[PDB]
Design a protein around this nucleic acid. Structure first.
Length: 164
DNA sequence: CCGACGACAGATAATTTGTCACTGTACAGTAGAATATAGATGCGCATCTATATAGATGCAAATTGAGTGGCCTTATTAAATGACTTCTCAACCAGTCA
């Protein structure tokens, strides 16, 4: 038996605006989990493999976000801030990137998927929807392990130089 | 002159050989045979041995069939096929017309 340890996981702190797909992706690298493994631990089954793709066709319910909150130690009201606000239409096909800000905070911000967003206001730069050199479309944000293009291996921080 | 010894010759009993008469003795059924022992050799019967096990057992892979566990897009409209549920199913009197 254990000598007086408290039950634990490699918890992670969320960044100031990352998407739920990106956060779950980091959580399941801090702990080595598969997408269906994290869904099974949370008790919500195969649901997590939709959310990592932004397949929010039926939206994340209060009861499902609370189930994830019991794993990841973030309350349901802070998990809701990683999803679009009520009636803010997102798009889940083109994954998009600022890249200039990815040097200030290495994350996929949820706001880059809003249908109303076309330029990052912190930097006044046009948002990217493909790698500026090889034209490859970005992987889903849960898979942003390297923080670079998967085809030509150019860092996302260097795509700051190639945009607008 | 007397005594002792050798040469030569002569005579003689001992020795050997032969002949002759009287005699003690074997021929008479008879010693190969009996009776111990040691020492070597051979046939028979028992008393071990050394080999030869096949059956039983323990064990260790080599699958082999039978499990169990882990991983997965979703909401509207329209047409098609196959089904379910509900509803309905008066009859003669009163006003024209050739």
């Amino acid at each position: 038996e254990a000598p007086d340890v408290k039950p634990w996981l490699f918890l992670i702190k969320p960044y100031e605006g990352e998407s739920l797909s990106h956060f779950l992706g980091r959580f399941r690298r801090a702990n080595h989990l598969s997408a269906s493994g994290l869904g099974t631990l949370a008790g919500i089954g195969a649901i997590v493999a939709r959310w990592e793709r932004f397949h929010f066709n039926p939206r994340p319910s209060q009861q499902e976000l609370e189930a994830i909150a019991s794993v990841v130690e973030v309350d349901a009201q802070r998990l809701a801030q990683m999803l679009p606000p009520a009636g803010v239409g997102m798009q889940h096909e083109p994954i998009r990137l600022c890249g200039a800000c990815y040097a200030e905070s290495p994350c996929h911000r949820i706001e880059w998927q809003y249908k109303s967003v076309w330029k990052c206001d912190r930097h006044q730069l046009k948002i990217l929807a493909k790698c500026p050199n090889c034209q490859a479309p970005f992987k889903m944000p849960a898979l942003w392990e390297d923080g670079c293009c998967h085809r030509c291996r150019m860092p996302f921080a260097e795509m700051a130089k190639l945009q607008k």
